[PDB]
Design a protein around this ligand. Sequence first.
Ligand SMILES: *Cc1c(COP(=O)(O)O)cnc(C)c1O
Ligand SMILES: *Cc1c(COP(=O)(O)O)cnc(C)c1O
Ligand SMILES: [Mg+2]
Ligand SMILES: [Mg+2]
Lengths: 408, 408
Amino acid sequence: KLLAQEPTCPRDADGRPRVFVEGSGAYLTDPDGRRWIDFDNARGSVVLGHGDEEVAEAIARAARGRSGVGTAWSPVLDSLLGQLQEVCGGDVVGLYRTGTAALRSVTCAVRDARDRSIVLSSGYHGYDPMWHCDEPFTPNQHGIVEFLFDLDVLAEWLSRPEQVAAVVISPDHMHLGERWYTEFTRLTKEADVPVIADEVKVGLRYRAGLSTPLLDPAVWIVAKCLANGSPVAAVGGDAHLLAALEDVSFTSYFEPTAMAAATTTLRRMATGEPQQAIRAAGDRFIAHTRAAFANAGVPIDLAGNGNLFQFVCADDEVADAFHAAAAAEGLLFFEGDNQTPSAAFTDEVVEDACGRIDRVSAALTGRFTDRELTEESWYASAWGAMDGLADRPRTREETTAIVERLWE
Amino acid sequence: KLLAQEPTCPRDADGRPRVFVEGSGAYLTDPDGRRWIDFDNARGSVVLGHGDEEVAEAIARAARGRSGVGTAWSPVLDSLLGQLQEVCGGDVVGLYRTGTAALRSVTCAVRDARDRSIVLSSGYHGYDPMWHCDEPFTPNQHGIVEFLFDLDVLAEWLSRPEQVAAVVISPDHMHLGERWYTEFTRLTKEADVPVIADEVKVGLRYRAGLSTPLLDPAVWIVAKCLANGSPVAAVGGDAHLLAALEDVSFTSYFEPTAMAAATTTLRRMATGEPQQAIRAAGDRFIAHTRAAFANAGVPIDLAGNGNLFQFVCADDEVADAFHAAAAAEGLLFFEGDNQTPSAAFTDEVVEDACGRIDRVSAALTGRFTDRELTEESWYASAWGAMDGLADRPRTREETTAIVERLWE
Ligand SMILES: *Cc1c(COP(=O)(O)O)cnc(C)c1O
Ligand SMILES: *Cc1c(COP(=O)(O)O)cnc(C)c1O
Ligand SMILES: [Mg+2]
Ligand SMILES: [Mg+2]
């Protein structure tokens, strides 16, 4: 009753936040002592695992003042900035406390440097009201045009390239492939319009770097993979587009526990070793689950890979039944959105999770055999998880019909 | 070089950041092993002392997953929200990662609820470009009117109150007295315009509550005194003005180390005991330093009190020489701004700092004896530390002259 905000979090079927009292690695414990396997992982920001020991020891030393103070530049900051530039590229780098703050700051800075008013956007960029819009494909009151990853609309807006400050996208790799990224980059290069790659979710997710070499971002942002859940985001890119960042400073800039979390995690994510382990383990879970449902006649498929995947259900009634059965087995999925295992999702947790999925599959068998995964199923599922239109062959008239069906 | 941002931090006379390796209580150690006394304390957010052990134990346990996980609601959140409402009041509360994010979100929410576009503002509210303006006393492109704590200008804008959504001020108590606040509240009550009290700096600074009962804020924000430097800011107040906060959610919302720091610190700040201890110790330092300078003919005075004070120097050459001498003695002041001791500024540290000040005063003696603090000295110093005009008697035409002198 006291909270004015509505934070995104796991909720029961009555909409009440699920409470978890502790976590370790891949397991959460609820107030009754029941253990759940976490695939949500603070919306994909816990990539090493809850309570990771190396990060925990670094945070504890930082909390005791051993690794610098919030008052001043610390011996480890240069190494953080240098590694961010080595891994992600760019002339210059910047730090923020949320993805939302980073996205607003760089978008305003790029727009100011470009002295142009229109920003073409796809994907979620945070909670700030500058991104709110009543309708797609037209400018909101902040000059932002949502284009739902539709390249026909993008091409039309880029046909008047001089009024476009930038194109900002949150890259998705479950439903957008090589053809989409090749054409996206072709259009933006042709228009000579800088690209802001919002990689808050996919930067460092798949490898020690940004998510695809088919993008040539003028500015990038990463965050969820950077600090095992501690509140750090980073940006980098062309110096002149980020000139306005000279005005950015905030009180907790040098706070040592955030710095310990980001440096310790980035050093490990820069080895590529966590992403390779998660990919293998998550891929085994996906393969098992896809086969389990298909053999049981359960109309649920999967998209994505071990690092980041989603469930595709025939309809919302199947999805509701799936989520209720998953919760009953102690599987904690980010409902309707993307599942992101951490490095604590090891071979033994995979076996546990596969066993829980066997019980989920048994619980759904015979209930929805008549339902089919349709083109509509895939569009609706993708929309819920990557905030726009899947790259599936479609006509322009179908684009309109899908958007009218799925908007709001 | 790599950093696109310009974070506020202690810098040498060439503008290079000073590095500190570790800190404990009130003492910092530099790369050469020299011990410095911190009066900056992460811009006033370290109020218990660097590496406070009780906070460090709470942070370390949270870092091991023992006190909730970033994935989900945990009991510590319920306790923090209740503590905030108990100490600061209000219908509802919200949490943010910086003061800047809190001020932008609250201001946007209040403007939306009030369905009016003009916001009257004094004081610093964070780094967001919404606060930037070319000129005081006129609306910027976001509808914000800077009025530099001038009540004649405020009265002028409030004489046509229906266009005014809110008045947001960062209360200063070094240069604005009880009569300023009585008239401010009289004017805003008369206009029936809600007040947003940006208490990011002074909330809980002087006692276990907001900074003055002479203000009647519809919405408050606190942060620097909340979490001993960990990145937490809080807001609260009238539910209808904060309705838009339902749209606020961010990935690290449930991050456990931040909540551990905030609950542990707030528990102590709620007793009023740290603020009383700091007041006493800082007052002893102020008294010693005022006399040391005055008795040596050094034209530097102090304003404020033990919780929050500043140096008032005759001119910029005196200020530069003072800062260089202080650094040479290992005194770390927030240059040109406010000094905010922590609860680790105990009798022993007071004695050490007073001896260091004796050497600063010795280094300055005989260099500036012929100079005096003028009204210009006081306006210039106050402008640098509290971001507007001191409450000194002046005409409307004199307001114009001071502002023309001091506006960048
Ligand atoms: C979550 C997310 C953001 C916002 O990050 P916060 O830290 O939650 O503000 C921005 N962009 C993308 C692509 C995201 O997934
Ligand atoms: C420092 C400060 C802010 C901004 O807070 P950050 O956490 O630095 O963004 C806002 N208001 C006041 C009064 C401040 O002193
Ligand atoms: Mg989503
Ligand atoms: Mg200041």
